[PDB]
C-alpha cells in the first residue's frame, strides 16, 4: 500500500534551479499521496569524511584502522554513528531513492559522495554474496536527477566531454546498481544557467510531468552496453 | 633542472597500503633530489563541503548564492578562505601532482572529491573559455594512484566491474583533463586485501620501480577512445 520516496538533495541554495527541482519532487509525490522525506545534505552539515568517528565505543582492531571491516563490523553490532544510522534508515523504509544535485567535476558534489561512501556500508547495502542483481537494496529504485553546466550538445560521443552515460557509470552501476538498486533513466536539465525562462520552465514541468507516471516506469539496463555500447 | 612533486593523499591510516605507497613515492622522489609536498587530507581535517564559508568577501548575489560564481569573484578578489588558497600554493608550483586512494565506489573518496571541488575553482584551474587543452594547469602532469577491493580480473570488459578504465574518466578526463593537466598512466593497485603478503610487497616495490623513470614518460591520449575504445 503507498509508497516511500527519500529525496537525497545536495544544493546549498533553496532558490536555485536544483531547489527547485527537489521542491517540484516533494510536491508531486506528495500530491500522489506517496510518503515523501528529504534530506537537505547541506542543511543537515552532513559529514563526508570517512573517519573512525563513524564507530562507536571500541574498534574491532584499534592498532590498525581500516574503515570498511570496521564499520562492515559496527552496522552487524549496531555501533554506528547516528547520523548514519538515521540516513539508513530512511532508505531503509525507502521504495524509491531520487538523488537531485549539480554535477561537479563529473560527479556527484562532496558531500553527497560522503552520504554515499558512510551510508552504504557493507552489511547494509551490499555484502560479499549480496551485490549487483543481488545487492542488499534489491527491490528498491534509484534514480538520479542531475543539472550540468555543459549543454547536452558538448555531452555526446564525439563531443567534448563525451556521452553523458559515459559519467553516470561510477554513479548508476558502481554505486546504485552494486547495492541492487534497479535504476531508473538519469533526468538531466542541461545548462540551466545558460537557458531561457521558457527552457527552464520546460526543463521543471518536465521533472514534475515525469514524475506524474514514475511508478509506471521500468528500470533501465543498467550494462556497460548501455553506458558505452550501441 | 629540478621538478617539485604535490602528493594529495587520502587514507585514515598510516600504516595502511596506501600509506606505503605515499611513503613510497616520498622516498624515491626525494631520493632523486626532488622537491616534494604531501597533502595529508584527513590528518589535516581537510574540509570536503562548497560552502558559503569559503567566501569571506561581500558576496557577488546575496540574495541567491552559486558557489561557482562567488568563488570565481573570491579567487579575484583574493578572498577565498585560507585552506583553499594554500592547497592551490602547492599546486601553482608542482610539475606533478599525483593522487594516492583508495577506490570509494568507482571515484575518489569524498574528502578527496571535497579537495578537487573546492580547490579547483574557476580563474585558477580554468576559465570559460579556457579548458581541456586550454586549461590554466597547462604544462603541469596529473597521476592517479588508486587500490581496490575488486580484482583485475573483476576489472576488464567482461568482468562484472567493466574495464578499469571506465572509472578514470570522471577522474582523468572531466577533471583533470579539463582543468589542463597531461594525464600519465594511472597506477592501480589492485585488490591489496586479498593479495599475499608477496604480492603486496611486489605491488609496492612495482610503484617504486616506475617513478624512478617517471620524468621520462609521456601522457596518455586522454580521449574517449582510450577509456572506452570502440
Ligand atoms: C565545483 C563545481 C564543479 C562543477 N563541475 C561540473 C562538471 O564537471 N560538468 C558540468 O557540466 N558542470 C559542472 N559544474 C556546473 C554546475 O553543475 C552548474 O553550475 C549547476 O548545475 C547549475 O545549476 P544550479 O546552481 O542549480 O543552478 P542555478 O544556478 O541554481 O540555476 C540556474 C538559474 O535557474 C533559475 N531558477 C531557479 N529556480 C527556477 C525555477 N523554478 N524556474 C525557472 N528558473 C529557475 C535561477 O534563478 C538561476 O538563474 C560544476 C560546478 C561547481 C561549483
Ligand atoms: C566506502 C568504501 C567504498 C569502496 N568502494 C570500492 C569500489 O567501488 N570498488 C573497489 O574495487 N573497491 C572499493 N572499496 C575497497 C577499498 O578500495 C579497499 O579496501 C582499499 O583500497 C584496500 O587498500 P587500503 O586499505 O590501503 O589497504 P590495507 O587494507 O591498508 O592493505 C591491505 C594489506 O596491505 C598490507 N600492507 C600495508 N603496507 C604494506 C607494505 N608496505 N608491504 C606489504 N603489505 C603491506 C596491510 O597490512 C594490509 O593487511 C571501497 C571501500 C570503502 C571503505
Ligand atoms: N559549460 C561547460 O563547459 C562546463 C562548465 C563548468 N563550470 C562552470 C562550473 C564545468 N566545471 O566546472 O567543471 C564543466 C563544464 N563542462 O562542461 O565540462
Ligand atoms: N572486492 C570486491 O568485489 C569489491 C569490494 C567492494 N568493497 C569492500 C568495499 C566494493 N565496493 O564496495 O564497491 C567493490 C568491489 N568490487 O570489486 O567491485
Ligand atoms: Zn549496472
Ligand atoms: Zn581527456
Ligand atoms: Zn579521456
Not at 582492531?61 to 538515521?86: C, M
Not at 542488499?136 to 543539472?147: N, P
Given at each position: ?101 549539480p554535477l561537479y567535476w563529473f560527479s ?38 542531475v543539472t550540468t553546466g555543459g549543454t547536452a550538445e558538448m555531452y555526446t560521443k564525439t563531443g567534448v566531454n563525451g556521452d553523458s552515460r559515459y559519467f553516470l557509470w ?16 538519469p533526468?538531466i536539465?542541461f545548462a540551466?544557467?545558460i ?32 553506458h558505452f555500447?550501441?
Amino acid at each position: 500500500a503507498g509508497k516511500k520516496v527519500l529525496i537525497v538533495y545536495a544544493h546549498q541554495e533553496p532558490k536555485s534551479f536544483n531547489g527547485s527541482l527537489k521542491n517540484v519532487a516533494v510536491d508531486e509525490l506528495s500530491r500522489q499521496g506517496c510518503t515523501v522525506t528529504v534530506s537537505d545534505l547541506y542543511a543537515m552539515n552532513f559529514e563526508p569524511r570517512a573517519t573512525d568517528k563513524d564507530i562507536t565505543g571500541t574498534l574491532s582492531n584499534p592498532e590498525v584502522f581500516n574503515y570498511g571491516v570496521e564499520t562492515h563490523e559496527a552496522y552487524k553490532q549496531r555501533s554506528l554513528a547516528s547520523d548514519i544510522t538515521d540516513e539508513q534508515k530512511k532508505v531503509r523504509e525507502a521504495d524509491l531513492v531520487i538523488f537531485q544535485f549539480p554535477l561537479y567535476w563529473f560527479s556527484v558534489p562532496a558531500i553527497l559522495k560522503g552520504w554515499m561512501d558512510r551510508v552504504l556500508c557493507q552489511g547494509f547495502a551490499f555484502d560479499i554474496p549480496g551485490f549487483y542483481d543481488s545487492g542488499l537494496l534489491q527491490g528498491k529504485l534509484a534514480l538520479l536527477s542531475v543539472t550540468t553546466g555543459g549543454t547536452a550538445e558538448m555531452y555526446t560521443k564525439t563531443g567534448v566531454n563525451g556521452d553523458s552515460r559515459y559519467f553516470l557509470w561510477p554513479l548508476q552501476h558502481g554505486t546504485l546498481h552494486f547495492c541492487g538498486f534497479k535504476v531508473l533513466a538519469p533526468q538531466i536539465s542541461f545548462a540551466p544557467e545558460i537557458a531561457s525562462e521558457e527552457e527552464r520552465k520546460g526543463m521543471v514541468a518536465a521533472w514534475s510531468q515525469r514524475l506524474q507516471t514514475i511508478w509506471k516506469e521500468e528500470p533501465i539496463p543498467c550494462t556497460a552496453h548501455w553506458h558505452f555500447g550501441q
